[PDB]
Design an enzyme around this catalytic site. Sequence first.
Site, PDB file in Angstrom:
ATOM      1  N   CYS A 107       0.967  -1.364  -0.112  1.00  0.00           N
ATOM      2  CA  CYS A 107      -0.160   0.181  -0.025  1.00  0.00           C
ATOM      3  C   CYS A 107       0.857   1.341  -0.207  1.00  0.00           C
ATOM      4  CB  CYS A 107      -0.728  -0.095   0.782  1.00  0.00           C
ATOM      5  SG  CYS A 107      -2.163   1.270   1.518  1.00  0.00           S
ATOM      6  N   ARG A 110       0.211   4.669   2.822  1.00  0.00           N
ATOM      7  CA  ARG A 110       0.078   4.506   4.224  1.00  0.00           C
ATOM      8  C   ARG A 110       0.034   5.755   4.949  1.00  0.00           C
ATOM      9  NH1 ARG A 110       4.369   0.134   4.672  1.00  0.00           N
ATOM     10  NH2 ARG A 110       4.283  -0.263   2.013  1.00  0.00           N
ATOM     11  N   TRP A 279      -9.379   5.925  -1.105  1.00  0.00           N
ATOM     12  CA  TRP A 279     -10.235   6.634  -1.400  1.00  0.00           C
ATOM     13  C   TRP A 279      -8.631   5.944  -2.949  1.00  0.00           C
ATOM     14  CZ3 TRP A 279      -8.557   9.861   2.333  1.00  0.00           C
ATOM     15  CH2 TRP A 279      -7.003  11.016   3.044  1.00  0.00           C
ATOM     16  N   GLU A 284      -5.146   3.690 -10.680  1.00  0.00           N
ATOM     17  CA  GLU A 284      -5.535   2.369 -10.663  1.00  0.00           C
ATOM     18  C   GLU A 284      -6.819   2.258 -11.511  1.00  0.00           C
ATOM     19  OE1 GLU A 284      -6.592   1.552  -6.105  1.00  0.00           O
ATOM     20  OE2 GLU A 284      -6.402   3.412  -6.499  1.00  0.00           O
TER      21      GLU A 284
END
EC number: 1.14.13.39
Lengths: 403, 405
Positions: A107, A110, A279, A284
Amino acid sequence: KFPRVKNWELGSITYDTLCAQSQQDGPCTPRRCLGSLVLPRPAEQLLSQARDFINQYYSSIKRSGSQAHEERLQEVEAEVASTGTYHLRESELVFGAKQAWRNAPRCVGRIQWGKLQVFDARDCSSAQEMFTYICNHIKYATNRGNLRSAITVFPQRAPGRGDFRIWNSQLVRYAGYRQQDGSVRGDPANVEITELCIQHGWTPGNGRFDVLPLLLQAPDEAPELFVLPPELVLEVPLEHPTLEWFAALGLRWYALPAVSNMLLEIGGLEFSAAPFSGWYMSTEIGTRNLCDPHRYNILEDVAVCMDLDTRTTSSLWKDKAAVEINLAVLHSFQLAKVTIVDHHAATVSFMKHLDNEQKARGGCPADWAWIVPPISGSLTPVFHQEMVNYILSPAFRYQPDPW
Amino acid sequence: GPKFPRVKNWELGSITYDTLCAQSQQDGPCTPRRCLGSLVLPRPAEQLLSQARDFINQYYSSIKRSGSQAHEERLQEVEAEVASTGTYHLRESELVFGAKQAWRNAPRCVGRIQWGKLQVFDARDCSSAQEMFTYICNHIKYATNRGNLRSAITVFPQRAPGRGDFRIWNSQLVRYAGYRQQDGSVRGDPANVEITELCIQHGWTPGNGRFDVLPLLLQAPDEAPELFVLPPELVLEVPLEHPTLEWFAALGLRWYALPAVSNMLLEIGGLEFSAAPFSGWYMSTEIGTRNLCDPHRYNILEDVAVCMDLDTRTTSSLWKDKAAVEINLAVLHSFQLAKVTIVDHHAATVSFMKHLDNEQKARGGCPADWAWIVPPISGSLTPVFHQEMVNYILSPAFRYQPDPW
Ligand code: HEM
Ligand code: HEM
Ligand SMILES: CCN(CCc1ccc(NC(=N)c2cccs2)cc1)Cc1cccc(NC(=N)c2cccs2)c1
Ligand SMILES: CCN(CCc1ccc(NC(=N)c2cccs2)cc1)Cc1cccc(NC(=N)c2cccs2)c1
Ligand SMILES: C[C@H](O)[C@H](O)[C@H]1CNc2nc(N)[nH]c(=O)c2N1
Ligand SMILES: C[C@H](O)[C@H](O)[C@H]1CNc2nc(N)[nH]c(=O)c2N1
Ligand SMILES: [Zn+2]
């Protein structure tokens, strides 16, 4: 030996000492590295993970060695000894969920890890009740476009029964209709869940962006179908700031990315349904979801509309169309006032996160292949950053599909 | 079922198992506790003999005479030689096989479809720095071939007991100078500030442009390195222009045609070839993305974005991504117009996927470093992004080695 971690752009060196806290083997051995692989191949046990987790919690609130601390370890030990399992306090759950997110190597977002609304849904006893909690989560997290990170934790796995599970991979997913000739209408990532929904009684649509119902499963019962009220599912029509024809594509994307198929592990306890959301990062949608050859695959259509020479790789038609598509996503989310982050701003924030974590914990587990974005890799600072990947707990893990 | 790493392609959904990784005799940097795949540089008679036997076994397999009398005689030959000298020597055909196998084995190289097509110049008779220069000039002339580039390696004498090494000090045969300025910035290529200053310490009179070709610092055994200027007419360069943006030519950007790596060690059968320069042709992203746009390299992104009249004050304009695309296009268009071989990152990655398939059948796997194989722009637009990869060290190999100073 603790790894030396070098940033090649700036020439600075750090040492990762956090990795010594990993009690869980990853896929690599000295003979061969398997870092690019997407998926992996008793009482004392639970009791040591549990004690380790209780220690982490009390340390975080600065109250290590306290009466509070020692008594909670006894509680945990008494409960495991007698019952083979135990239960977290709400405050521990809250700390454990934030820490699972902190610890996720894949991720890039973070920097936000401390800001997580935790909904406790461990008192849930039916699929019906899961639906209500999920609706409140969507409502809270969406917030009319000012998105807020959230997680809803359903009851833990128990030795003597089936798991609570959300069958869908995200709370919002578009349908994928397989044609009799192998091709797909909609999102080909979702063909299998789409067919499951129909087979469980859903009347299907036939468009490219039909929102799926949820299949929600309480222990040892067939899953149940629940259609989300359209008003709860915020979507963003996609247009381009300068290319007028782009809106004519009829493209859209949902505002809320909410992962619902991962297992949340805290202190040896496992939460098989614990959907979480934040979000999107624009790439992506713009790069993967819209341009992957096995997803919506729209690169060719955009290139034709842009009049690019599609006949040769060396015109960089793919690259040009991808860029415009990512720009459209950013523009459209901004116009709709819906939270989104571009891959430059996101990776800059991750660099700051790495520095924060170096100071706070002596390292940060990160999976380079997932952190570096899928366009403009070396244009972002994370490309030039060495990283060390390892499993810390609390953790978000993959688990089998329940069918 | 199979007790070997399972390797998945997520675009096509297909699965293979890598059985080649079993032939690895050398540890990488990873353990069960932590993956170090993203690190650029993670940190005796019987030893030689076993490396030598393995290599000789590889050779005899490649020509299908494993277990033959020729094979057992060559093994005896090698042990006898090591027995009496502490070392041994490669037949010509063994050096050729081993240099191709080292390329074939390189996990970071996306160009391996071509591995079978390599001209091996045998320079194992070289005995002076002047002679290395002649060999290097010949290599450059052959490989450049007026723009129609041909892969080649030139192999200088192997490391020998006591005696000093042949070394080329320069990281590549062609490099632009990097001159540290009063203000602390760099004119030219910042990657080359150290070799530039070493050239100056060794008597080179420096220029002061952004694209000054460096002299070679060549070291013959136990001698101070000597300085050689490449005849300018031997160093083919490509001025850069853009197919539609007419001002891009006014920027005066250029790049050289021939990428020729000169600071790596070629290891074959335990033998160490410390000077063994090799060259192929560029993939366009090495020039247009890394060399021209890295912030620690020529760093031209902002200048190009300004000429394109982009909004450079906000990340969400995607100014960087748009400038990078045009710079990459200019590189491709300019090489093309100049008739100098180059390959774009789509064509390269596709051909690497074919390579992976060929190697699956031929050897049961292909060591590959995903972070280096996936291009630095447009990652997931290439088929390699979606392809899992198993990274491991096989020998013969190209290895990094400490700088000679
Ligand atoms: C606040 C904004 C956030 C952003 C911009 C963000 C960004 C991302 C991105 C881009 C990925 C890669 C996803 C993909 O390639 O499919 C990801 C993975 C992940 N993030 Fe986040 N993240 C955010 C918040 C969160 C939150 C709230 C959690 C959990 C509480 C979380 C946990 C994860 C996990 C577990 C993964 C890995 C999923 C996997 O391995 O398949 N992130 N993040
Ligand atoms: C035929 C054309 C070729 C192309 C397009 C090509 C492409 C590439 C590229 C793009 C890289 C990464 C370079 C970087 O990021 O700095 C690379 C690495 C490499 N290639 Fe090639 N290659 C070719 C031929 C060759 C040849 C002829 C050899 C040797 C005989 C070779 C051996 C290597 C090695 C050893 C590396 C690794 C460098 C390192 O770790 O620092 N390749 N290749
Ligand atoms: C768990 C699913 N992830 C995507 C998870 C994800 C995480 C983060 C985001 N994006 C976000 N910004 C956020 C979501 C939640 C908070 S932030 C989006 C998706 C991808 C993934 C990983 C590993 C394996 C698979 N599996 C598959 N693709 C399979 C298809 C068919 C059989 S397996 C998928
Ligand atoms: C050995 C140098 N490689 C790049 C080699 C390279 C390989 C291939 C190409 N491109 C080509 N197409 C070819 C060249 C030859 C045949 S094909 C260009 C360069 C980069 C690299 C890797 C690891 C470490 C370093 N070293 C360093 N950057 C430093 C160390 C200490 C201070 S700086 C450099
Ligand atoms: C094979 C490879 O690991 C795979 O395609 C990965 C690469 N990097 C990724 N990075 C992110 N963020 N998300 C992904 O799904 C992937 N897929
Ligand atoms: C930290 C990271 O490993 C480093 O920047 C790597 C990533 N991938 C690369 N890939 C190639 N081809 N060349 C490189 O120099 C690098 N750099
Ligand atoms: Zn690894």
